[PDB]
Each structure stands twice: as C-alpha cells, then as structure tokens.
Amino acid sequence: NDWHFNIGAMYEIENVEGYGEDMDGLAEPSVYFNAANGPWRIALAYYQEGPVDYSAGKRGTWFDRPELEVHYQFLENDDFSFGLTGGFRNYGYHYVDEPGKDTANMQRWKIAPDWDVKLTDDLRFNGWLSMYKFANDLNTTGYADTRVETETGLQYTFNETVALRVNYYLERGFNMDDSRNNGEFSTQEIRAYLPLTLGNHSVTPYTRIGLDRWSNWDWQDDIEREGHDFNRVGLFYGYDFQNGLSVSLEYAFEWQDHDEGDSDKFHYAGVGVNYSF
Ligand SMILES: CCCCCCCCCCCC[N+](C)(C)[O-]
Ligand SMILES: CCCCCCCCCCCC[N+](C)(C)[O-]
Ligand SMILES: CCCCCCCCCCCC[N+](C)(C)[O-]
Ligand SMILES: CCCCCCCCCCCC[N+](C)(C)[O-]
Ligand SMILES: CCCCCCCCCCCC[N+](C)(C)[O-]
Ligand SMILES: CCCCCCCCCCCC[N+](C)(C)[O-]
Ligand SMILES: CCCCCCCCCCCC[N+](C)(C)[O-]
Ligand SMILES: CCCCCCCCCCCC[N+](C)(C)[O-]
Ligand SMILES: CCCCCCCCCCCC[N+](C)(C)[O-]
Ligand SMILES: CCCCCCCCCCCC[N+](C)(C)[O-]
Ligand SMILES: CCCCCCCCCCCC[N+](C)(C)[O-]
Ligand SMILES: CCCCCCCCCCCC[N+](C)(C)[O-]
Ligand SMILES: CCCCCCCCCCCC[N+](C)(C)[O-]
Ligand SMILES: CCCCCCCCCCCC[N+](C)(C)[O-]
Ligand SMILES: CCCCCCCCCCCC[N+](C)(C)[O-]
Ligand SMILES: CCCCCCCCCCCC[N+](C)(C)[O-]
Ligand SMILES: CCCCCCCCCCCC[N+](C)(C)[O-]
Ligand SMILES: CCCCCCCCCCCC[N+](C)(C)[O-]
Ligand SMILES: CCCCCCCCCCCC[N+](C)(C)[O-]
Ligand SMILES: CCCCCCCCCCCC[N+](C)(C)[O-]
Ligand SMILES: CCCCCCCCCCCC[N+](C)(C)[O-]
Ligand SMILES: CCCCCCCCCCCC[N+](C)(C)[O-]
Ligand SMILES: CCCCCCCCCCCC[N+](C)(C)[O-]
Ligand SMILES: CCCCCCCCCCCC[N+](C)(C)[O-]
Ligand SMILES: CCCCCCCCCCCC[N+](C)(C)[O-]
Ligand SMILES: CCCCCCCCCCCC[N+](C)(C)[O-]
Ligand SMILES: CCCCCCCCCCCC[N+](C)(C)[O-]
Ligand SMILES: CCCCCCCCCCCC[N+](C)(C)[O-]
Ligand SMILES: CCCCCCCCCCCC[N+](C)(C)[O-]
Ligand SMILES: CCCCCCCCCCCC[N+](C)(C)[O-]
Ligand SMILES: CCCCCCCCCCCC[N+](C)(C)[O-]
Ligand SMILES: CCCCCCCCCCCC[N+](C)(C)[O-]
Ligand SMILES: CCCCCCCCCCCC[N+](C)(C)[O-]
Ligand SMILES: CCCCCCCCCCCC[N+](C)(C)[O-]
Ligand SMILES: CCCCCCCCCCCC[N+](C)(C)[O-]
Ligand SMILES: CCCCCCCCCCCC[N+](C)(C)[O-]
Ligand SMILES: CCCCCCCCCCCC[N+](C)(C)[O-]
Ligand SMILES: CCCCCCCCCCCC[N+](C)(C)[O-]
Ligand SMILES: [Ca+2]
Ligand SMILES: [Ca+2]
Ligand SMILES: [Ca+2]
Ligand SMILES: [Ca+2]
Ligand SMILES: [Ca+2]
Ligand SMILES: [Ca+2]
Ligand SMILES: [Ca+2]
Ligand SMILES: [Ca+2]
Ligand SMILES: [Ca+2]
C-alpha cells in the first residue's frame, strides 16, 4: 500500500486577436482529482471551453467535458518504464446562434501507451502516443471519428538545475468511415523545453516549431486542404510550497501564418493550484 491524492483547479485563456470566432477569447475553467495506489492511478476531471463576449456578458457555443481515466504501470525501473492509460470523456455542446442546432453529446474513448527508457546516465528516451475514437453526434459536432497523437523524444540532464527536452509531436484527425468528411487535420511539430530548477521554483522556457500542418474545416465548399505555419514560444513558472500545495503560471505567444490568409496572433494564459495529499 499507500494511497496518494491530488486535487486542483486551472483557469486558462486562449485567444486569436481580433473578434473572430473565439470572440474575446476562449476561457476554460477546470477542476481535477486523482488517486494512486501503487501501479494504479485513477483521475477525474471536469472542464468547460467556449468563447466569451466580456462586455455583452455572453457565451458563444461552448462545451463541458467530464472525464475519467485509469492508468496502469506495467513496469517502473530506472532503466525502463511502460504504462498504459484508458480514458473516456463526454463533450456536451451548447450551441448559440447556430441555426438548426441546440445540443449535442459526443464521447471520446482513448487508449495510450507511455514509456521511458534510459540511454545513458544522462540521456533518456520518452514519449506516449494516444488513439482516440469519437462516437456520437459527429455531423453536428463536426469532429472526425478518429485521431492519433504523439510526443516522443529525448531528454538530457546537464545537472540538478538544468535539463533539455526535444520532442517530435504529431496530431492527426481522420475519419475511418468514408461517409465522412468532418474536421480532418494534421499537425507535426518539434517541441523543445528547457526546464530550470532552483529550490522551490521551476521556470521552463519552451517553444514549438512547426514542421507541417493543414486543416480542412471548409471542406464542403472548398475540398482541398489549407496549409499553415505555426510557431509558439512560452514560459511556464511554478512554485512548490513545500506542503504540498503548489501553483503555476504560464504564458505563450504563437504566430499563425496561413497559406491563404493574412496571419494571426494567438495568446495562451493559465494559472493553476494543486494540493497533494
Ligand atoms: C471519490 C472520492 C474518494 C475519497 C478520497 C478522499 C480520501 C482522503 C484521505 C486523505 C489521507 C491522505 N493519505 C492517505 C494520502 O495519506
Ligand atoms: C472552487 C474550485 C476549486 C477547487 C480545486 C482545489 C484547489 C486547491 C485546493 C486548495 C488547497 C487545500 N488546502 C487548504 C488543504 O491546502
Ligand atoms: C486567487 C483566488 C481566485 C478566485 C477566483 C474566483 C473563482 C470564480 C468563482 C466561480 C463562480 C462564478 N459565478 C459568479 C458565476 O458563480
Ligand atoms: C497575476 C496574473 C494576471 C495577469 C493576466 C494577464 C492577462 C492576459 C490577457 C489575455 C487576453 C484574453 N482575454 C482576457 C481578453 O480573454
Ligand atoms: C487559481 C486556480 C484556478 C482558479 C479558477 C478555477 C475555476 C475552476 C472552476 C471549475 C470548472 C467548472 N466550471 C463550472 C466553472 O466550469
Ligand atoms: C474533478 C471531479 C469532478 C468534480 C466536478 C463536479 C462535476 C461537474 C458538475 C458541474 C459543475 C462543476 N463545478 C461544481 C466545479 O462547478
Ligand atoms: C476529503 C475530500 C476532498 C475532496 C476531493 C475528493 C472528492 C473528489 C471526487 C468526487 C467526484 C465529484 N462528484 C461527486 C461531483 O462527482
Ligand atoms: C473515482 C475516484 C477514485 C478514488 C477512490 C480511491 C479512494 C480509496 C479510499 C481508501 C483510503 C483508505 N485509507 C485511508 C486507509 O488509505
Ligand atoms: C479498466 C480496467 C479495470 C480497472 C478499473 C480501475 C480500478 C482500479 C483498482 C484500484 C486498485 C487499488 N488497490 C490495489 C488498493 O485496490
Ligand atoms: C466527473 C464528475 C461526475 C459527472 C458530473 C456530471 C456533470 C456532467 C455535465 C452535465 C452538465 C452539468 N451542468 C448542468 C452543471 O451544466
Ligand atoms: C461513472 C463516473 C464517470 C464520470 C464521467 C462520465 C460523464 C458522463 C455524463 C454525460 C451525461 C450526458 N447526458 C446523459 C446528460 O446526456
Ligand atoms: C487501460 C488501463 C490499464 C488496464 C491494465 C490491466 C491491468 C493488468 C494487471 C495484471 C497484473 C498481472 N500480474 C503481473 C500480476 O501477473
Ligand atoms: C477505455 C478503452 C477503450 C479503447 C478504445 C481506443 C480506440 C482507438 C481508436 C481507433 C479504432 C478505430 N476503429 C473503431 C475503426 O477501430
Ligand atoms: C485493455 C483495456 C481496454 C478496456 C476494454 C474496453 C471496454 C470499453 C469499450 C468501449 C465501449 C463500451 N460500451 C459499449 C459498453 O459502451
Ligand atoms: C476508463 C473508464 C471507462 C469509462 C466508463 C464509461 C462511463 C459512461 C459510459 C456512457 C456510455 C455513453 N453511450 C452513449 C455510449 O452510451
Ligand atoms: C497521455 C496524454 C497527456 C500528456 C501528459 C501525460 C504525461 C506522460 C504520460 C504519463 C502517464 C500518466 N501518469 C499517471 C503516469 O501520470
Ligand atoms: C538510436 C540510438 C539510440 C542511442 C543508444 C546508444 C547509447 C549508448 C550507451 C552507452 C553506454 C555505455 N555503457 C555501456 C558504459 O553504459
Ligand atoms: C538518431 C541518430 C543518433 C541519435 C541517437 C541518440 C544519441 C546517441 C548518443 C548516445 C551516447 C553515445 N556515447 C558514446 C556518447 O555514449
Ligand atoms: C531522432 C534523433 C535525431 C538525430 C540527432 C541526434 C544527435 C544527438 C543525440 C543526443 C546525444 C548527445 N549526447 C550523447 C551527449 O547527449
Ligand atoms: C488540441 C486539438 C486541436 C486541433 C483540432 C480540434 C478538433 C476540431 C474538430 C472540428 C470541431 C469544430 N468545432 C468548432 C465545432 O469545434
Ligand atoms: C529526438 C528529436 C526527435 C526529432 C526527430 C525529427 C522528426 C522528423 C520529422 C519528419 C518530418 C515529417 N514530414 C513528413 C512532415 O516531413
Ligand atoms: C526520437 C523521436 C523520433 C521521432 C520519430 C517517431 C515517428 C515519426 C515519423 C512519423 C511520420 C508521420 N508521417 C507519416 C505523417 O510522416
Ligand atoms: C535533448 C537533446 C540532447 C542534447 C545533447 C547535449 C550534449 C551535452 C554535451 C555536454 C558535454 C559534457 N561536458 C561538459 C562534460 O563536457
Ligand atoms: C518541462 C516541464 C514543464 C512543462 C510544462 C510546459 C508547458 C505546459 C503546457 C500547459 C498547457 C498548454 N496547452 C497545451 C494546454 O495549451
Ligand atoms: C515568472 C518568473 C518568476 C521568477 C522567479 C524565479 C526566481 C528564482 C530565485 C532563486 C533563489 C531561490 N533560493 C533563494 C531558494 O535559492
Ligand atoms: C529551449 C526552449 C527555450 C524557449 C524558447 C526561446 C526562444 C527561442 C526562439 C527565438 C525567439 C524569436 N522571437 C523574437 C521571434 O521570438
Ligand atoms: C530556438 C531553436 C531554433 C529555431 C529555429 C527555427 C525557427 C522557425 C521559425 C520560422 C521558420 C523560419 N526558418 C525556416 C528560417 O526557420
Ligand atoms: C537534437 C536532435 C536534432 C533533431 C532536430 C529535428 C530537426 C529535423 C527536422 C525534421 C524534418 C524537417 N522537415 C523539413 C521534414 O520538416
Ligand atoms: C532544439 C533542436 C531543434 C532543431 C529545430 C529544427 C528545425 C526544423 C526546420 C523546420 C522548418 C519547416 N519548414 C518547412 C516550415 O520550413
Ligand atoms: C528519426 C527520424 C525518422 C525519419 C522520418 C523522416 C522521413 C521523411 C519523410 C519524407 C516525406 C516526403 N513527403 C512529405 C513528400 O511525403
Ligand atoms: C499568482 C502568483 C502566485 C505566486 C506566489 C508564490 C510566490 C513565491 C513566494 C516567494 C518566497 C516566499 N519566501 C520563500 C521568501 O518565503
Ligand atoms: C512576491 C509573491 C508573494 C508571495 C506570497 C506570500 C506567501 C509566502 C510564501 C511562504 C513561504 C514559506 N516557505 C516556502 C519559505 O517556506
Ligand atoms: C501563491 C498563492 C498564495 C497562496 C498562499 C500560500 C500559502 C502558503 C503556506 C500555506 C499555509 C502554511 N502554513 C500554515 C504551515 O504555514
Ligand atoms: C509566468 C509567465 C508570465 C510572464 C508573462 C510573459 C511576458 C511577455 C509579455 C507578453 C508579450 C506579448 N507579445 C508577444 C504580443 O508581445
Ligand atoms: C504575476 C506575474 C505577472 C503577470 C504578467 C502579466 C503580463 C502579461 C501580459 C501579456 C499580454 C501582452 N499582449 C497584450 C501584447 O498580449
Ligand atoms: C501570465 C499568467 C496568466 C495567468 C492568468 C490567466 C487568466 C487571465 C484572466 C483573463 C483576463 C480577462 N480579462 C480581464 C481580460 O477580461
Ligand atoms: C494571480 C491570481 C490570478 C487568479 C486567476 C483567477 C482569475 C480569473 C477568474 C475571474 C474571471 C476573469 N475573467 C476572465 C472573466 O475576466
Ligand atoms: C479542498 C479539500 C482538501 C482536503 C484534503 C485532505 C483531508 C484529509 C485529512 C488528512 C489526514 C487526516 N486523517 C487522519 C484523516 O488522516
Ligand atoms: Ca484547448
Ligand atoms: Ca481573430
Ligand atoms: Ca478573439
Ligand atoms: Ca468589446
Ligand atoms: Ca520542488
Ligand atoms: Ca478547404
Ligand atoms: Ca482553400
Ligand atoms: Ca502545409
Ligand atoms: Ca501567409
């Protein structure tokens, strides 16, 4: 035995500047709770996402997203670790001035291997990969029935204060049922992180470098895919209290170049707390 728990909350913001589809930005509140006992770990989350008009005081089309995940660690050694996560979410949508739409419920099932393997005293290879099935209101939801996503690479530890991580990242959305159509996309990036450790402070500068990316949200009128270049930099800061409440702040800017398109400017901001017990 022994049980250990974490509870926490996050508020985050995502916003393409201009009063576009995300009006004044996407605001996203969430709470989560998790519980671990040796090889088992179980996690609950609730989270909402939708655009906001702050002066009008209004939400646009938004969803909430309750979630359950259980993870089993098959093996954990300094030399090797392999674990597997099952999960499930419901995305409950509430439409606002979308003609012929009110409500929808779409589920998402995921299986995800995860691994860590020691290369030398200082260098490790780690990653996970997830496979997702979306299930119910796909035509009104406009999601694609299937997607894969992975982040995998190398981590070098220089000392107790500095480490570096480079990852390859991929996200692909695609439909295995050819009667669809909706929301296919593909993103590939390299992400690099430079975590820095001093006492109770973690500050980590990071960046994502675009490799290749396309979307086709307008497929019904324009069936060819739109290409993009995105590059992001950000900074994460956290502080441990040491008891074990901890808090964190994060900010990132992203340049969004389109092939057809004037470019966009995107900001992400977030704060969170949690408490381990
Ligand atoms: C569905 C909720 C499950 C109840 C979880 C609450 C248990 C709190 C116990 C705190 C004890 C701290 N402990 C055992 C980790 O040392
Ligand atoms: C209002 C929803 C937020 C609830 C999520 C929990 C936030 C962190 C909990 C605060 C720490 C608890 N405490 C006093 C034992 O440290
Ligand atoms: C540093 C503590 C920050 C606390 C921020 C306040 C949390 C928001 C409370 C949610 C309730 C919103 N409301 C009024 C619609 O019910
Ligand atoms: C102490 C933390 C407070 C700093 C808050 C920084 C504000 C970021 C503004 C992002 C703009 C998007 N917004 C708010 C209009 O949705
Ligand atoms: C300081 C950490 C985060 C503060 C704000 C956290 C808001 C969490 C609220 C839980 C989300 C559920 N709900 C109903 C608001 O969507
Ligand atoms: C993280 C475990 C689940 C706790 C969240 C409560 C279930 C969803 C109910 C909707 C309102 C969420 N709430 C109370 C935080 O605002
Ligand atoms: C000592 C209690 C600490 C509070 C956190 C543990 C409860 C989280 C799990 C309850 C799930 C929330 N619910 C009931 C709305 O589904
Ligand atoms: C659905 C969320 C899963 C969390 C449930 C795990 C709670 C187990 C509580 C047993 C704790 C017994 N104790 C205090 C002696 O450790
Ligand atoms: C989906 C696979 C079935 C597993 C469902 C999740 C339940 C986890 C069991 C927790 C076991 C913890 N323990 C040994 C203290 O009982
Ligand atoms: C994971 C927590 C257990 C299930 C909580 C049920 C909340 C799911 C969302 C339904 C909408 C909630 N509501 C009416 C406050 O918006
Ligand atoms: C049994 C615990 C599982 C927690 C996560 C499951 C949330 C499902 C709630 C969705 C309810 C939507 N509904 C039925 C109102 O349309
Ligand atoms: C998707 C969540 C992971 C569920 C994995 C199922 C648990 C397998 C545990 C079997 C342990 C067998 N063993 C090693 C004791 O012989
Ligand atoms: C909670 C465990 C459930 C795991 C389900 C994982 C689904 C991965 C999606 C790809 C499957 C596509 N499909 C339906 C044609 O087979
Ligand atoms: C390797 C562990 C995988 C977990 C087994 C998959 C069971 C869940 C299958 C998803 C659909 C479940 N259903 C039809 C009852 O809703
Ligand atoms: C890894 C945990 C497995 C999640 C258990 C499933 C909970 C809710 C299932 C609701 C089924 C939804 N629907 C429409 C397919 O019936
Ligand atoms: C799995 C997709 C979510 C990305 C963040 C997860 C970090 C790597 C996976 C760790 C496995 C989960 N667990 C319980 C060991 O923390
Ligand atoms: C794709 C190749 C991955 C790199 C693997 C090569 C790592 C070299 C390990 C050197 C180990 C030295 N030794 C035996 C003393 O430990
Ligand atoms: C993918 C092509 C080469 C990259 C493989 C990973 C790095 C190999 C370095 C392992 C360490 C070798 N040595 C002799 C310094 O220990
Ligand atoms: C997919 C890997 C790309 C090939 C390029 C990697 C070459 C350098 C690998 C890092 C090893 C340097 N070293 C041994 C000190 O850490
Ligand atoms: C982190 C995932 C980001 C990439 C794609 C998100 C899935 C969107 C699929 C189409 C959904 C359209 N809409 C506006 C209803 O969300
Ligand atoms: C250890 C660092 C891992 C980085 C390895 C570099 C990934 C190469 C990506 C291949 C390019 C994909 N494609 C087909 C769009 O060009
Ligand atoms: C050490 C990390 C190296 C990254 C290699 C992992 C798989 C990358 C190749 C995926 C190519 C994607 N695709 C098919 C769209 O080109
Ligand atoms: C995550 C990618 C791996 C980057 C590899 C970093 C190479 C470190 C070489 C440092 C040389 C060691 N030193 C100072 C003793 O000379
Ligand atoms: C390397 C240790 C620190 C890693 C954390 C840095 C990035 C955290 C990303 C937070 C969430 C941003 N996102 C993907 C939701 O938009
Ligand atoms: C948002 C960035 C915040 C910057 C705070 C970083 C300051 C680290 C101070 C290191 C000194 C810690 N100390 C005294 C325990 O050694
Ligand atoms: C290893 C992660 C370090 C975080 C990223 C640091 C920024 C490096 C990229 C150059 C930034 C150029 N500029 C002005 C367009 O931002
Ligand atoms: C901070 C690591 C070095 C990053 C260098 C690549 C940054 C990509 C920014 C736009 C791409 C322009 N290009 C091809 C000249 O790099
Ligand atoms: C530290 C290891 C160095 C790996 C750095 C990864 C950059 C290679 C670029 C991958 C493919 C580039 N391209 C053009 C296919 O997108
Ligand atoms: C921290 C080491 C990472 C090295 C970064 C490698 C940059 C790969 C070049 C990407 C350029 C892709 N493209 C086609 C948009 O120019
Ligand atoms: C560890 C690196 C693995 C090698 C991945 C790089 C494969 C290059 C793929 C070239 C694809 C050309 N294209 C885009 C026309 O298909
Ligand atoms: C909204 C940001 C919350 C950050 C609060 C945490 C600040 C770190 C406290 C600094 C040091 C206190 N100390 C160690 C001198 O006692
Ligand atoms: C400049 C940010 C203000 C910091 C907020 C006040 C909380 C004080 C931090 C408690 C420090 C206790 N500590 C970690 C020395 O043991
Ligand atoms: C960073 C946000 C400010 C939250 C306040 C931080 C609490 C610091 C210490 C918690 C209580 C510690 N205690 C009672 C032993 O001193
Ligand atoms: C913990 C991170 C908090 C620091 C906030 C980041 C400082 C940079 C200010 C945002 C710059 C916006 N931009 C790129 C449009 O100039
Ligand atoms: C508590 C740490 C201090 C918070 C710092 C807040 C400054 C971030 C503002 C970034 C927004 C700049 N802008 C409007 C060009 O995007
Ligand atoms: C740089 C860290 C950012 C932490 C705060 C994230 C939440 C910001 C709250 C959104 C601001 C809304 N507002 C005031 C523009 O209307
Ligand atoms: C530095 C502490 C910041 C705590 C973050 C919680 C503040 C955001 C919650 C209030 C909502 C503000 N908003 C986005 C409606 O303008
Ligand atoms: C925001 C809710 C935070 C509550 C977290 C912890 C409550 C559990 C009590 C700790 C241990 C005391 N006792 C004997 C039950 O173990
Ligand atoms: Ca998001
Ligand atoms: Ca805009
Ligand atoms: Ca906007
Ligand atoms: Ca306004
Ligand atoms: Ca610490
Ligand atoms: Ca198109
Ligand atoms: Ca087009
Ligand atoms: Ca492209
Ligand atoms: Ca352009």
Side-chain angles (χ1 to χ4, degrees), residues 248-264:
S248 72
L249 247 22
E250 190 157 354
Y251 170 84
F253 186 78
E254 190 169 81
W255 300 260
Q256 310 190 341
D257 299 344
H258 321 269
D259 284 1
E260 43 243 285
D262 300 5
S263 308
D264 290 302

Side-chain angles (χ1 to χ4, degrees), residues 190-257:
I190 116 105
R191 334 245 261 200
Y193 307 75
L194 184 81
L196 306 177
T197 308
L198 216 300
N200 284 333
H201 297 95
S202 331
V203 39
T204 137
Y206 63 85
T207 174
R208 316 183 172 163
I209 299 141
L211 257 23
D212 181 62
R213 159 168 206 144
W214 56 262
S215 67
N216 203 192
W217 321 109
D218 68 8
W219 70 270
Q220 183 76 99
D221 300 288
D222 168 82
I223 196 181
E224 280 207 48
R225 270 124 58 143
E226 347 316 320
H228 306 296
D229 256 70
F230 288 13
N231 295 274
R232 183 174 294 203
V233 312
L235 185 83
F236 173 83
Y237 170 82
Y239 182 86
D240 182 15
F241 265 104
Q242 301 129 263
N243 59 184
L245 173 75
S246 67
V247 299
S248 72
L249 247 22
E250 190 157 354
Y251 170 84
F253 186 78
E254 190 169 81
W255 300 260
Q256 310 190 341
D257 299 344

Side-chain angles (χ1 to χ4, degrees), residues 133-160:
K133 196 75 199 188
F134 290 77
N136 283 112
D137 283 303
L138 298 188
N139 254 41
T140 114
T141 255
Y143 280 57
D145 61 33
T146 303
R147 93 172 68 145
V148 195
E149 175 186 28
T150 197
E151 180 153 12
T152 188
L154 260 33
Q155 176 191 102
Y156 197 73
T157 301
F158 292 89
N159 53 236
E160 328 80 359

